[model samples]
Target: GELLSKNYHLENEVARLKKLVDDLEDELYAQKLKYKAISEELDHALNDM
Candidate 1:
């Protein structure tokens, strides 16, 4: 009984962690877009000067 219970708990934990990874990846993608926008704006300003 203890063995099976432990395995079940680990499975649940793995699923939870996978979901967290997915969310973080999405956040990272969003941040990348913001970075790209800033870089483009900065380049334009430098060219103007």
Candidate 2:
């Protein structure tokens, strides 16, 4: 019974971390796009000068 409980807990942990990884990846992509947009604006301003 204890072994079964341990296995169940381990599965739960795996599921939790997987969702966390997915969330972080989504956040990372959003940040990258934001940074890219800022860089583009800065480059355009520099070119104008």
Candidate 3:
């Protein structure tokens, strides 16, 4: 019984960590896209000048 309860708690913790990791992954993807866009713009501007 105690082992079952411990396993349940660990499962909950794993779920929470998974959610946090997913959120962070999404955030990182957005930042990377933004960085790429800005870099392209800068390169174009420099070429134009």
Candidate 4:
């Protein structure tokens, strides 16, 4: 019974960690897109000058 309980706890922890990692990945992707857009705009403005 104790072992089973411990296993359940570990499984829950793993699930929570996976979710956090997925969220971070999504955020990172979004930030990268924003960064790219801004960088392109800056390059264009510089070229115009």
Candidate 5:
């Protein structure tokens, strides 16, 4: 009985963590784009020099 309860709790925690990871994965592309834009600015600056 205690083991069953513990399993339920662990499953719930795993679901929550997976949902959070999915949310972060969805946002990842915007972050990469922002990073690429800034990095490109530096690239152009170097070329200008």
Candidate 6:
């Protein structure tokens, strides 16, 4: 919905950014794995077990 294409139907077209959807899902999965590994490393360093 832009200046020339102001034809938005709200409830239906609002969730239609069907462009960068796959990118976000992939990045989220990678970040979760990296964060989990880093967290385990930190836990060992501070807990001293």
RMSD of each: 0.8, 0.9, 1.1, 1.1, 1.8, 5.3
Estimate, for each residue in 1-49, the C-alpha lDDT of model 5 and write its tens digit: 6999999999999999999999998799889999999999999999997
Lowest summed lDDT across 10 adjacent residues in model 5 is found at 25-34
Winning model by TM-score: 1
Model 4, global lDDT: 0.99
The superposed Cα distance between candidate 1 and the true structure at residue 39, in angstroms, equals 0.6
* Per-residue lDDT over 1-49 for candidate 6, one digit per residue giving the tens place of the 0 to 100 score: 2744555455346565443566787889899999999999999999996
Model 2: lowest-lDDT 10 consecutive positions: 1-10
Candidate 2 residue-wise lDDT at 4: 96
Write down the lDDT that model 6 would get.
0.75
Per-residue accuracy of model 2 over 1-49 as CA lDDT, tens digit each: 6999999999999999999999999999999999999999999999998
Residue pairs clashing in model 5 are none
Scored by Cα lDDT, where does model 1 land? 0.98
Q: If scored against the real structure, what TM-score would every candidate get?
A: 0.91, 0.87, 0.86, 0.85, 0.71, 0.52
Number of the candidate with higher TM-score, 1 or 4: 1
Tell me the number of clashing residue pairs for each predicted model: 0, 0, 0, 0, 0, 0
lDDT of 3 by residue, 1-49 (tens): 6999999999999999999999999999999999999999999999997
Clashing pairs in 2: none
What's the alpha carbon RMSD for model 1?
A: 0.8
Q: Residue 42 of model 1: what lDDT?
A: 96
